Enzyme design. Structure first.
Site, mmCIF file in Angstrom:
data_model
loop_
_atom_site.group_PDB
_atom_site.id
_atom_site.type_symbol
_atom_site.label_atom_id
_atom_site.label_comp_id
_atom_site.label_asym_id
_atom_site.label_seq_id
_atom_site.Cartn_x
_atom_site.Cartn_y
_atom_site.Cartn_z
ATOM 1 N N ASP A 1 9.464 -1.588 5.880
ATOM 2 C CA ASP A 1 10.775 -2.246 5.778
ATOM 3 C C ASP A 1 10.962 -3.336 6.837
ATOM 4 O OD1 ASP A 1 13.367 -3.057 5.132
ATOM 5 O OD2 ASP A 1 14.082 -1.010 4.794
ATOM 6 N N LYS B 1 13.700 2.966 13.341
ATOM 7 C CA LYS B 1 14.324 4.268 13.130
ATOM 8 C C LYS B 1 13.275 5.168 12.463
ATOM 9 C CE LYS B 1 16.298 2.563 8.805
ATOM 10 N NZ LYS B 1 17.421 2.602 7.815
ATOM 11 N N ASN C 1 11.702 4.638 8.866
ATOM 12 C CA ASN C 1 10.832 3.500 8.596
ATOM 13 C C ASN C 1 9.391 3.684 9.083
ATOM 14 O OD1 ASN C 1 12.798 2.080 7.242
ATOM 15 N ND2 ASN C 1 13.254 0.637 8.927
ATOM 16 N N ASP D 1 14.775 -3.056 12.938
ATOM 17 C CA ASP D 1 15.137 -1.894 12.117
ATOM 18 C C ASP D 1 14.361 -0.636 12.536
ATOM 19 O OD1 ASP D 1 16.970 -0.933 10.113
ATOM 20 O OD2 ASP D 1 15.501 -1.103 8.519
ATOM 21 N N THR E 1 21.028 0.142 12.031
ATOM 22 C CA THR E 1 21.758 1.405 11.910
ATOM 23 C C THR E 1 22.485 1.723 13.221
ATOM 24 O OG1 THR E 1 20.215 2.242 10.254
ATOM 25 C CG2 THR E 1 21.496 3.874 11.453
ATOM 26 N N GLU F 1 0.849 -1.191 0.000
ATOM 27 C CA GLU F 1 0.000 0.000 0.000
ATOM 28 C C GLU F 1 0.885 1.241 0.000
ATOM 29 O OE1 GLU F 1 -3.220 -0.117 2.952
ATOM 30 O OE2 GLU F 1 -4.252 -1.418 1.518
HETATM 31 C C1 LIG Z 1 16.366 -7.592 3.099
HETATM 32 C C2 LIG Z 1 17.745 -7.237 3.644
HETATM 33 N N1 LIG Z 1 18.507 -6.220 2.851
HETATM 34 C C3 LIG Z 1 18.606 -6.624 1.428
HETATM 35 C C4 LIG Z 1 19.567 -7.794 1.255
HETATM 36 C C5 LIG Z 1 17.910 -4.866 2.966
HETATM 37 C C6 LIG Z 1 17.976 -4.212 4.363
HETATM 38 O O1 LIG Z 1 16.953 -4.662 5.245
HETATM 39 C C7 LIG Z 1 16.664 -3.631 6.222
HETATM 40 C C8 LIG Z 1 16.718 -2.360 5.374
HETATM 41 N N2 LIG Z 1 16.837 -1.071 6.089
HETATM 42 C C9 LIG Z 1 17.702 -2.727 4.227
HETATM 43 O O2 LIG Z 1 18.935 -1.958 4.124
#
Ligand code: A1JEG
Length: 340
Positions: free
Chosen positions: A174, A158, A161, A156, A191, A111
């Site tokens: 994400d 932050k 996202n 993840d 990060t 979406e």
């Molecule tokens: C699916 C994992 N990788 C691709 C191999 C992508 C990372 O996942 C978290 C996101 N912030 C991104 O940078």
């Protein structure tokens, strides 16, 4: 907890497990969509606004180049993301509508949320008032209660996202580092500013790392900058493991107390990871004004509504060079991505 909460989470896990064990695959194809604009770019792919040619609906299409997904853990994470996203259902998670693959790329069609990233709005205003930060934080607390009860860790969190929707509420996007974990896990990912000490020290870690990252997010929303920062990651890491944090004078005493318990370097003492679990957070004085059921039902008036003109407006996202979506004559990495 109340029996209604326990039964809600039991049903949530039943519904997740059914989709987890029989994942959806191959539910659209590329020439079903018109490409409109690139909304973001990274080391492995990009996100584009697209329009479905038959229905006219807008979507956010994430495109991953299979040949840039080389390491064993990169392949694992790519498969984690799609399997988890097609199985979850919660008011503050972005919904996956279609997925498919071709000779060159993997595609996830989500979406489209036109209000933009929280990060943009936070940097424009400077900082959020405590009631504003608390409205967003309550949504993350409920979302982690949901995910952790499915044995999922997010990994993840932050501001980039967290998308803001047409009602001013959060949609989390994400799932690239999300994983189903019974026990501990060990991968270095995330990060630097948001990493818990036990990730930096290469320990086996658990859902406590998500509660640490919530502490970092709340601090950043209320102060305007994160608690640990520096030009080099190694310097950031030294600050994180040290067990020291300075608070602005304008922080309330209740906010400082909650943050000391989320930014607890000893994971066995950290809020969210004690015997009462998430309820140590929900019952803390900083959240005393929060109606948890009203937030879940989206009945609370939001601090602000993003300005946009319609479902296809891109004015809350930024400008990137527009590049081809090349699809090779030959298949690439078929064996690695058979389950996608
Ligand atoms: C699916 C994992 N990788 C691709 C191999 C992508 C990372 O996942 C978290 C996101 N912030 C991104 O940078």
């Amino acid at each position: 907890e109340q029996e209604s909460v326990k039964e809600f989470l039991a049903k949530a896990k039943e519904e997740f497990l059914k989709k987890w064990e029989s994942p959806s695959q191959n539910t659209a194809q590329l020439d079903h969509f018109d490409r409109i604009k690139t909304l973001g770019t990274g080391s492995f792919g990009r996100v584009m606004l697209v329009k479905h040619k038959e229905t006219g609906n807008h979507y956010a299409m994430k495109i991953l180049d299979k040949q840039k997904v080389v390491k064993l853990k990169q392949i694992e994470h790519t498969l984690n993301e799609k399997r988890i996203l097609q199985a979850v259902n919660f008011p503050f998670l972005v919904k996956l509508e279609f997925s498919f693959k071709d000779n060159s790329n993997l595609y996830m069609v989500m979406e489209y949320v036109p209000g933009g990233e929280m990060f943009s709005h936070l940097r424009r205003i400077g900082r959020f008032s405590e009631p504003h930060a608390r409205f967003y934080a309550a949504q993350i607390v409920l979302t982690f209660e949901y995910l952790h009860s499915l044995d999922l860790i997010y990994r993840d969190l932050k501001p980039e996202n967290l998308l803001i929707d047409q009602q001013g509420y959060i949609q989390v996007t994400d799932f690239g580092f999300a994983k189903r974990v019974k026990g501990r896990t060990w991968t270095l990912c995330g990060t630097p500013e948001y990493l818990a000490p036990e990730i930096i020290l290469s320990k086996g870690y658990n859902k406590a790392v998500d509660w640490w990252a919530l502490g970092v997010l709340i601090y950043e929303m209320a102060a305007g900058y994160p608690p640990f920062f520096a030009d080099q990651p190694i310097q950031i890491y030294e600050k994180i493991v040290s067990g020291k944090v300075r608070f602005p004078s304008h922080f309330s005493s209740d906010l400082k107390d909650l943050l000391r318990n989320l930014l607890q370097v000893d994971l066995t003492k950290r809020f969210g990871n004690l015997k009462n679990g998430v309820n140590d957070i929900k019952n803390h004085k900083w959240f005393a004004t929060t109606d948890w059921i009203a937030i879940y039902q989206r009945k609370v008036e939001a601090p602000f509504i993003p300005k946009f003109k319609g479902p296809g407006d891109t004015s809350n996202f930024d400008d990137y060079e527009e590049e081809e979506i090349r699809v090779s004559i030959n298949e690439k990495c078929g064996k690695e991505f058979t389950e996608f």
